[PDB]
Structures are given as C-alpha cells and as structure tokens.
Amino acid sequence: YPQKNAELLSAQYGTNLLLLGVSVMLALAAQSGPVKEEHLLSFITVLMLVQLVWMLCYMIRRERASWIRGGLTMLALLSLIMDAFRIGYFVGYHAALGVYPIVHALHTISQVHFLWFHIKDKKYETFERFGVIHAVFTNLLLWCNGVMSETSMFSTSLYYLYPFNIEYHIFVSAMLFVMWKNIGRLGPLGGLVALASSVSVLVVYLIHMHEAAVSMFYYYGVAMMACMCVGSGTGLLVYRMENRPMDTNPARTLDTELLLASSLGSWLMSWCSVVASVAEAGQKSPSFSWTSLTYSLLLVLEKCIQNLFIVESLYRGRKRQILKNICMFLFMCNISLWILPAFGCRPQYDNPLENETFGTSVWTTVLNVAIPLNLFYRMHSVASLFEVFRK
Amino acid sequence: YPQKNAELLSAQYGTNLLLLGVSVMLALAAQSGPVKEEHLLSFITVLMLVQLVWMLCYMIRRERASWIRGGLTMLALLSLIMDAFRIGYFVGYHAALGVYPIVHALHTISQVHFLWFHIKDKKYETFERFGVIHAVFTNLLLWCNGVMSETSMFSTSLYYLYPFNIEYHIFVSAMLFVMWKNIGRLGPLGGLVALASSVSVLVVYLIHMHEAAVSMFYYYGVAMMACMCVGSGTGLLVYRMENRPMDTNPARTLDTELLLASSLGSWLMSWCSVVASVAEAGQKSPSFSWTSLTYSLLLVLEKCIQNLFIVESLYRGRKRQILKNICMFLFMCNISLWILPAFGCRPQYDNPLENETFGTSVWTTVLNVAIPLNLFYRMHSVASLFEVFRK
Ligand SMILES: CC(C)CCC[C@@H](C)[C@H]1CC[C@H]2[C@@H]3CC=C4C[C@@H](OC(=O)CCC(=O)O)CC[C@]4(C)[C@H]3CC[C@]12C
Ligand SMILES: CC(C)CCC[C@@H](C)[C@H]1CC[C@H]2[C@@H]3CC=C4C[C@@H](OC(=O)CCC(=O)O)CC[C@]4(C)[C@H]3CC[C@]12C
Ligand SMILES: CC(C)CCC[C@@H](C)[C@H]1CC[C@H]2[C@@H]3CC=C4C[C@@H](OC(=O)CCC(=O)O)CC[C@]4(C)[C@H]3CC[C@]12C
Ligand SMILES: CC(C)CCC[C@@H](C)[C@H]1CC[C@H]2[C@@H]3CC=C4C[C@@H](OC(=O)CCC(=O)O)CC[C@]4(C)[C@H]3CC[C@]12C
Ligand SMILES: CC(C)CCC[C@@H](C)[C@H]1CC[C@H]2[C@@H]3CC=C4C[C@@H](O)CC[C@]4(C)[C@H]3CC[C@]12C
Ligand SMILES: CC(C)CCC[C@@H](C)[C@H]1CC[C@H]2[C@@H]3CC=C4C[C@@H](O)CC[C@]4(C)[C@H]3CC[C@]12C
Ligand SMILES: CC(C)CCC[C@@H](C)[C@H]1CC[C@H]2[C@@H]3CC=C4C[C@@H](O)CC[C@]4(C)[C@H]3CC[C@]12C
Ligand SMILES: CC(C)CCC[C@@H](C)[C@H]1CC[C@H]2[C@@H]3CC=C4C[C@@H](O)CC[C@]4(C)[C@H]3CC[C@]12C
Ligand SMILES: CC(C)CCC[C@@H](C)[C@H]1CC[C@H]2[C@@H]3CC=C4C[C@@H](O)CC[C@]4(C)[C@H]3CC[C@]12C
Ligand SMILES: CC(C)CCC[C@@H](C)[C@H]1CC[C@H]2[C@@H]3CC=C4C[C@@H](O)CC[C@]4(C)[C@H]3CC[C@]12C
Ligand SMILES: C=C(C)COc1ccccc1NC(=O)c1[nH]cnc1C
Ligand SMILES: C=C(C)COc1ccccc1NC(=O)c1[nH]cnc1C
Ligand SMILES: C=C(C)COc1ccccc1NC(=O)c1[nH]cnc1C
Ligand SMILES: C=C(C)COc1ccccc1NC(=O)c1[nH]cnc1C
Numbered sequence A, B: 001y002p003q004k005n006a007e008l009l010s011a012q013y014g015t016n017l018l019l020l021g022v023s024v025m026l027a028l029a030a031q032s033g034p035v036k037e038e039h040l041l042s043f044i045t046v047l048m049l050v051q052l053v054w055m056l057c058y059m060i061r062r063e064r065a066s067w068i069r070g071g072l073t074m075l076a077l078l079s080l081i082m083d084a085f086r087i088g089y090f091v092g093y094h095a096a097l098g099v100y101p102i103v104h105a106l107h108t109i110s111q112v113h114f115l116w117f118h119i120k121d122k123k124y125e126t127f128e129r130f131g132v133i134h135a136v137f138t139n140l141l142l143w144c145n146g147v148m149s150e151t152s153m154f155s156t157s158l159y160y161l162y163p164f165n166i167e168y169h170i171f172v173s174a175m176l177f178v179m180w181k182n183i184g185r186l187g188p189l190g191g192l193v194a195l196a197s198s199v200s201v202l203v204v205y206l207i208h209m210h211e212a213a214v215s216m217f218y219y220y221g222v223a224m225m226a227c228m229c230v231g232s233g234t235g236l237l238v239y240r241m242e243n244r245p246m247d248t249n250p251a252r253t254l255d256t257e258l259l260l261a262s263s264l265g266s267w268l269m270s271w272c273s274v275v276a277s278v279a280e281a282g283q284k285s286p287s288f289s290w291t292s293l294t295y296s297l298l299l300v301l302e303k304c305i306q307n308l309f310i311v312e313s314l315y316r317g318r319k320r321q322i323l324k325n326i327c328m329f330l331f332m333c334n335i336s337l338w339i340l341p342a343f344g345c346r347p348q349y350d351n352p353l354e355n356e357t358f359g360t361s362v363w364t365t366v367l368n369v370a371i372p373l374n375l376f377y378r379m380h381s382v383a384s385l386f387e388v389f390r391k
Helices: A003-029 A037-063 A066-093 A096-116 A126-149 A156-181 A187-207 A211-241 A250-261 A264-282 A290-314 A318-342 A352-357 A360-390 B003-029 B037-063 B066-093 B096-116 B126-149 B156-181 B187-207 B211-241 B250-261 B264-282 B290-314 B318-342 B352-357 B360-390
Strands: none
Touching (some): A003 B290, A003 B360, A037 A096, A066 A096, A066 A360, A126 A360, A250 A290, A290 A318, A290 A360, A360 B003, B003 B037, B003 B126, B037 B096, B037 B126, B066 B096, B066 B156, B066 B360, B096 B156, B156 B250, B156 B360, B187 B318, B211 B318, B318 B360
C-alpha cells in the first residue's frame, strides 16, 4: 500500500473524527436541541474504547527528553486522581457519568503505558498512522469536553485538579501529533525572593479581606513581570552585543513551536482583559484601574520577550556570569509564576469587569483554555531555562 | 539583525494581532457589552489602513501558477463590485459603515496590485516579514468579520456576492501566509449531461413549487456525488493495478494541503447535518428522511475519494483512455457542482431541521464558513483535474 495514500487517508479520517465531535458539541451548546450531554459523554466513551482496543492490539503485535515524559506522567497521575474522585462520587451517588470515569481511567493508564514503551518502526505503518491520529483527535475532543463542561470533598478537589486534566489532554495530543508526523521517516537571591513572595501570596489568598488579597496578587504579578521583562531584555542585549553566528535540531524546533503555541491562551486572556478595560474606560467610569491594563500588557510583553530570549539562547567573563544569573533568575521566576495558578490562586474567574463585558460563560471558557496552557508554558519555560543554564 | 529573531517576532506580532481581533469579536458576540459593531469595523479599518501604508512604502522602495492569480483577481473583482454596491448604499442612505467600504475597496485594489507585482528578495527582510504577517491576519480578521456579520437591488445583490468576498479573504490570507513562510529562502458525454443538469436545476430553483425544487437539488446532488465517487474510485483502482514507484515539488505540496484544507467547511456542514438527522431520528419522528443523511455521507466520502485520487494523480492503452475520461468527467462534474452554489442555489440555509437542532445563528455561521470553502474546493479541484488531464 503506497505510503502517501496512508499519510493522507489517516489525516482525512482524523479530521472527520474531529469535525464530527465538534458537530456534536455544537448540537449540545444550543441547549434546546435533542442532543444532551450524556450523548457527548457516550460518543467520547466510544472514542476512548476504540483507542483502548487499538493499543491492546498494538501491544499484542509489538511482542512478536525525560522532561516531557516525566511531565506527561505527573499530569496523567493528577488526571487519574481526579478520575478516582469521580468514580467515588458515582459509587456514592449512582448512567453515562459512571461509565465515563472508568473508561477514562483505563484510557489514561493505557496511554501512559503506551507513551512510555513506544518503539519507532515498519511493516505496520497504516495501523500506526490510523491509531496515532485516532489518539490525537480523541485527546483533542477530550480537551474540548473538559473546557466546555467545567463551565463534601468532591467539589473542593475538582477545582484544584481540573487544570491539570485539561493541560494533560492538550499536551498528550500535541505529543501524539508530533509522533504521527514522524511515522516511516545576584540571580539566586532574586530567585529566592521570588519563590518566597509567591508562596506567601498564595498562603495569604487561600486563607482569605479577599479584595486586598486579589489586589496583592495583581501587584505581585505586575512587579514580577516587570523585573522578568528586564531580565530577559538584558539577556537579549548581551546577545546583541556579542555578535555570534546564531546558527545551529528537531528537538530545538519542537521546543520553539511548543513555547510559542502555549502562549495563545495567556495572550487571549490578556487581550480580553485589555478590550474590557478600554471598553469600560470609554464610558468614563470610576471602575477603570491601570493595574489590570498594565498587568495584561505586561503579560503579553513578558511572554514575547521571554520567547525571544529562550529561542535565541537555544539556536546560539562577565557576560557568562550575567547570562548564568539571568537564566537562574528566570528559572525561579517562572517557578514562582507556575505555583500561583497551580495551587489555587486563580482569582481571574470572579472578575466582574470581564464577566460583564464578555459574559460569565465566555470568560470562564477563555480562562479554562488559558490557565492550563499558562501552566504548561511556565513549566516548559522552566525546563528550557535550565537546559540553557547548563550550556 | 538575526533572521530567526525576525521570523519569531513577526509571528508573535501577527498572533497577538489575531487574538486582539478575536477578543473584540468576543466582546461583540455578547450583545450586552459596551463593544458594538462600529467599534469592530473601526478596528478593522485601522488594520486595513496600516496595511495600505505598508504597501505604499513597499512600492516606493521597490522602484529603487496563473490559475491562482486569475482566481484571486476574479474574486477580488467580485469583492470590489460588492464594495461599490455598499458605497452606493451609503451615499444614498448616509458613519463607520461609509468609511469602511471605501478603505476596503482601496485595500482590495492595493492588494491585487501587490500580489500581481511582487518580487522575491534581501536587505529588507524584517519589513517584508512584519508586513506580510500583518496582511495575513488582517485578511483573516476580515474573513471573520464577514462570517460573523452576514449572520431595492442592495439586498438581492449582496446575497449573491457575499460568498465570493468571504472566499476571497480566506484565499488571499492563505496565499499571503504561504508567501510569508518563504521570505529569505464516454467521459465528455457524462460531463456534458452533468453541466446541462446543473444549469437546468439552477434555472428551475431560481425561477421558484419550492419544496419540489429543493428536493430536486438534493436528488441531483446525491446522484452526482454517487457517480463521482464511482469515477474517482475507478481511477484509484486503475492506479492500484498499475503498480508504479509513486515518488516525485513545493507547488504539488501546496496543492495537496489547499485541497485538504478547503474541505473542512463541507465536512463540518455534512457532519452537522448527520448529527441533526440522527438526533431527530432518535425521537422516532416522521420527519427523518434518508436523502439528507445520504447526501451528507456522500459529501464526506466523495471529497475524501476525490482528494485521494487527485493527490495520487499528482505524485505519480486502455488505462490511458480510462484515466483521460475519468479526469474529464470529474472536471465537468466539479464545474457542475460549483455552478449551483455560486449562482444562488444555496437551499441549506432554510433547512428547518438544522435550524431547530443547532439554532439559526449557528447553522448560518456554519454555512457561511462552509459554502465559500466549498466553492474554493470545487474550483481548485477543477484546476488540479485539468493539470492531471494534460499529463
Ligand atoms: C487542532 C487545532 C484546531 C487546535 C484545537 C482547537 C479546536 C479543537 C477548537 C477550535 C475552534 C473550536 C470550536 C469553536 C467554537 C465552538 C462553539 C461553541 O458553542 C457556542 O459558541 C454556542 C453558540 C450559541 O451561543 O448559540 C462550542 C464549542 C465550539 C464548537 C469549539 C470546539 C473546539 C474547536 C473546534
Ligand atoms: C489549543 C491551541 C492549539 C489553540 C487555541 C486557540 C484558542 C484561541 C481558541 C480554541 C478554542 C476557542 C474557544 C472555543 C469556544 C468558545 C466558547 C464560546 O462561548 C460559548 O460557547 C458560550 C455560548 C453561550 O453561552 O450561549 C466563546 C468562544 C470560545 C471561548 C472560543 C474562543 C477561542 C478559543 C479559546
Ligand atoms: C489560522 C487558523 C486559526 C484559521 C482561522 C480561524 C480563526 C480565525 C477562528 C478559529 C476559532 C474562531 C473563534 C471561535 C469562536 C468564536 C466565538 C463567537 O462568539 C460566540 O460564540 C458567542 C458566545 C455566546 O453565545 O455567548 C465569536 C467568534 C469567535 C471568537 C471565533 C473567531 C474566529 C476564530 C478565532
Ligand atoms: C479556515 C480554516 C483554516 C479552518 C476552519 C475551521 C472551522 C471548522 C471553524 C473556524 C471558525 C469556527 C466557527 C467560529 C464561530 C462560530 C459561531 C458560534 O455561534 C455564535 O457565535 C452564535 C452565538 C449566539 O447566537 O449567541 C458557533 C460556532 C462557530 C460557527 C464556529 C464553528 C467552527 C468553525 C467554523
Ligand atoms: C504526587 C503528585 C502527582 C501530586 C499529588 C497531589 C495530591 C496529593 C493532591 C492533589 C489535589 C489534592 C486534593 C484537593 C482538595 C482536597 C479537598 C479537601 O477537602 C481535602 C483534601 C483534598 C482531597 C486534596 C488532597 C491532596 C490532593 C489529592
Ligand atoms: C485561534 C488560534 C488557533 C489562532 C492562531 C493560529 C495560528 C495563526 C498560529 C497557531 C500556532 C502558531 C505557530 C506556533 C509556533 C511557531 C514557530 C515559530 O518559530 C514561528 C511561528 C509559528 C510557526 C506559529 C505561526 C502561527 C500559528 C500557526
Ligand atoms: C504536582 C503538582 C502540580 C501537584 C499540586 C497539588 C496541589 C494543588 C495540592 C497539594 C496539597 C493540596 C492542599 C492540601 C490540603 C488542603 C486543606 C484543605 O482544607 C483545603 C485544600 C488544601 C489547601 C489543598 C489544596 C491543593 C493542594 C495545594
Ligand atoms: C466579470 C466577472 C468578475 C463576473 C461579474 C458578474 C457581475 C456582472 C454580477 C455579479 C452579481 C450580479 C448582480 C447580483 C444581483 C443583482 C440584483 C438585481 O436586482 C439586478 C441585477 C444585479 C445588480 C446583478 C447584476 C450582475 C452582477 C453585478
Ligand atoms: C477546527 C478545524 C481547524 C480543525 C482541524 C485542524 C487540524 C487538525 C487540520 C487543519 C488542516 C489540516 C492539514 C491540511 C492538509 C494536510 C496535508 C496532507 O498531505 C496531510 C494532512 C494535513 C497536514 C492536515 C492535517 C490536519 C490539519 C492541520
Ligand atoms: C465569476 C463568476 C463567479 C460570477 C458569477 C456571477 C453570478 C452570481 C451572476 C451573473 C448574472 C447574475 C444574474 C443576472 C440577472 C438576474 C435577474 C434578477 O432579476 C435577479 C438576479 C439575477 C438572476 C442575477 C443573479 C446572479 C448572477 C447569476
Ligand atoms: C518532574 C517534573 C518535570 C514534573 O513537574 C510537573 C508537575 C505537574 C505538572 C506538570 C509538570 N511538568 C511539565 O509540565 C513539563 N516539564 C518539562 N516540560 C513540561 C511540559
Ligand atoms: C501545546 C499546544 C497548544 C498543542 O497544540 C496542538 C493541538 C492539537 C494538535 C497538535 C498541536 N501541536 C502541534 O502540532 C505542534 N506543536 C509544536 N510542534 C507541533 C508539530
Ligand atoms: C479564470 C479563472 C480561473 C477564474 O475562475 C473563478 C471565478 C470566480 C471565482 C474563482 C475562480 N477561480 C478559482 O478560484 C481558482 N482557480 C484555480 N485555483 C483557484 C483557487
Ligand atoms: C484554504 C484555507 C482554509 C486557508 O487556511 C489558512 C487560513 C489562515 C492562514 C493560512 C491558511 N493556510 C495555509 O497556511 C496553508 N495551506 C496550504 N499550505 C499552507 C502553508
């Protein structure tokens, strides 16, 4: 069977799968069509079952860097803890919402065991193509279901565990698509101050009275992003002074594309905040404050300059010390900016300004898309910054 | 200035431009936010003005195949006729809706004159990068505005001219993105029967009483897509019999990717129709008919087999006659299937089944995304089929 024929048919089957899923979600979004949620959950359950059957055959036939695998395993284990909580709820409160968690837990176990023990190889190329493309778009549809459906201890625990589930499904979908295309072919002192201020702000918030806490969160974010922009810009300036060939790797290219694709969520969130801020300021209202406009423009500019710095640092006496201290300072700053959203410091959802401009559903869906991508971006940047720091 | 630095900053600026536009459209979609339509029209007017300023500088500094250019010129001239109609309306019925049509007409004139007389070149690479990426995302935002806002003779003419405007903006955006990435680097008898039946069905419909006309449209489409699937499949079978190396071009790759990206609209439309059909059939209702389910599954399968055939025909005595007659038959069938939507035979919008399942706004937006892409697909396939027919 010709290779191109399969590279094309696999892609068409996968795209049709995604568009059928999107069609069912559109029928659901209406809320007056016959299509109800349990039909979507059943569709995705069938799409997870087929993938389990495929991976089972694959493991039957197969018998006859670490940063991305450890990240996938830890996000899959958080997703599994969430599923265990959902199975416990179902058992206590007893149809499709009981059978979904169990096929989801089996799907995550099989998918971790597959990603870990996968071997690149040759006779079975159509099988691998159609199965990886099924896995990619089943994980995308699961990401979409999570983003659309999240709009005693069973309510307090999901709040903390949903971002990692959504981030797990988009991440594994990205890695599986990357695997499809290739078938058949002083700085420490500042860093510590950053970590301490982060953990403090988080404890303060989660103990909380509350408006002062969110104000403290925004002031922290603004100061942190300003000093980060300064660090990355000084790194770029030291690069521009020391004119070097700036030439030469698939891994480096994947890293660049992931680093720039993980920022779409935060950029959308920042531009929604800026649009709401200027719209409300047009009314000549007392509500307009410059700590949300500044914090959003600094979000945009900080992740732009950081992306530029990391990419220029990967494709490339006092300059060596200056780059070491800049890389360590940004390492610790990105850790400090990852700990806040991860540990429940997500105060954006209750913002009354973007809830009144965009509506509660649109704002919470934008945040559900953005905050998981933000966590991924921050920790991918931490990995890239350590890799730069070692060179 | 390093090249990568610019390839990256251009992409980040363009992505931020797109996300700011999407944020303004989200603020508009709510319908209760301060953001009203004239603010979007003004944003896009600024984004067209900046592009005109860029192209003016570019033409100042520059002094010191044909299928895709003729297609762009003819779709730009239809868009210009639409803009002339809008300027005439404004003049008769007299703020932002008057200044938008005129900057849009200037933008289309400048953009045609730019695409025609563009030269690949070297000192000014950052300028070209930032300007082509501005053009790509300004054309995308114009596509989005058209798709979202279309949801005496000034009402009858836009109905016929809007699909070509939307198709023009997505097409020119695609070509400009393709231009960005490369900076600094018997069958005739059946075919005639097809053409005659098309023109007949169209005249019948536009003269119309009406339910029989839409039924005739669906029966025509079903028979035509069945015989097309048979033709493409027989071509693929003749290929599979004659085992050939099936090896070896940038143009061929662009053609394949455009041919498969133009089908997303039709596939989404077909899967929405299938989801609505099975949802209504679940109620055990008398409305369920198999001429909409069949016509949708045939849409999906026909464009899959056609894509496969064209791609296998580009990357590659009675077999030669059989392939000539198959290519000519599909040439004329795709012309017959392009003439119906182009000349006003668009009966999908008034479908009560997908209007009740998905809602009128979601269905009309899905059709506004799909029917322009469908026209592009059909005529791109006609071009590819003639190119195959000559070899
Ligand atoms: C591989 C690439 C495309 C990245 C993955 C992203 C997609 C999976 C996204 C892109 C656009 C998304 C769609 C865009 C908007 C909608 C409409 C939304 O419903 C409404 O807006 C309801 C409208 C109403 O209020 O009536 C439901 C989700 C859906 C289908 C989204 C589902 C997920 C999609 C396909
Ligand atoms: C994952 C990477 C590769 C791409 C991310 C691109 C995002 C900018 C896209 C993808 C999904 C999109 C969302 C898909 C669906 C929705 C829900 C939609 O609102 C509803 O569905 C509510 C309807 C109602 O309340 O009646 C508003 C737009 C939004 C947030 C979309 C905004 C644009 C998003 C976030
Ligand atoms: C370069 C690639 C991404 C192709 C180009 C496609 C994008 C320009 C599309 C993909 C998803 C689209 C968005 C997905 C859904 C929405 C939500 C829609 O508003 C609602 O659904 C309102 C929700 C409600 O009812 O409350 C307005 C358009 C918007 C922002 C879309 C704008 C155009 C987007 C960004
Ligand atoms: C152009 C190529 C490269 C990609 C095409 C992908 C499409 C499948 C995406 C892009 C734009 C998306 C649309 C963007 C916005 C909308 C409008 C949205 O409905 C509303 O905004 C209505 C809100 C209301 O009525 O309150 C429903 C989903 C839909 C049609 C989205 C469905 C998925 C679409 C067609
Ligand atoms: C080892 C790696 C993967 C980290 C694991 C973190 C685990 C231990 C975390 C993640 C989410 C957490 C839960 C989130 C919230 C609640 C609800 C509260 O009323 C009791 C504690 C409980 C139930 C937490 C227990 C600890 C928990 C399960
Ligand atoms: C609604 C969302 C999806 C809008 C954004 C879609 C498009 C414009 C985005 C999505 C991801 C983006 C890519 C992500 C990363 C890279 C690698 C970088 O070295 C050059 C730019 C490039 C190649 C980007 C180009 C623009 C891009 C393709
Ligand atoms: C691997 C990483 C990402 C795991 C992160 C797990 C985080 C979210 C977990 C670890 C310990 C957890 C806390 C443990 C106990 C409590 C006390 C309880 O009364 C409220 C929830 C709260 C405050 C939990 C919140 C979530 C928490 C901070
Ligand atoms: C030369 C190429 C680009 C094709 C051009 C086609 C032109 C001539 C077509 C496209 C749309 C057409 C218009 C669409 C509908 C109407 C409204 C009707 O009440 C009078 C005729 C009028 C005003 C048409 C005149 C002819 C028209 C302008
Ligand atoms: C809502 C819409 C955008 C969903 C679809 C998005 C993704 C999955 C689609 C959009 C366009 C698609 C590409 C279009 C064309 C080609 C060239 C072909 O030789 C291999 C598949 C490939 C490379 C497709 C892969 C899947 C793809 C990237
Ligand atoms: C280059 C190609 C795509 C141009 C296509 C232009 C098409 C849409 C134009 C050409 C001539 C036009 C027709 C000319 C005259 C009339 C009679 C009028 O009472 C109703 C509109 C109607 C029936 C027009 C409909 C649109 C039309 C068919
Ligand atoms: C030991 C570890 C790296 C795990 O730390 C985590 C804990 C929870 C969630 C995610 C991650 N890690 C990541 O996401 C990561 N690391 C590098 N690249 C990515 C994408
Ligand atoms: C991190 C993300 C937002 C994931 O985005 C995706 C979503 C669905 C499918 C694929 C991808 N990512 C990619 O394909 C990619 N990223 C880098 N290099 C490639 C080839
Ligand atoms: C002489 C012509 C080709 C023009 O015919 C048209 C008329 C109206 C609208 C579009 C087109 N042509 C196309 O769209 C085309 N041709 C090849 N590739 C594409 C994308
Ligand atoms: C025909 C379309 C649906 C256009 O889709 C787009 C929309 C916005 C920007 C770019 C593209 N198309 C591409 O980038 C493309 N198509 C083929 N090869 C490339 C490199």
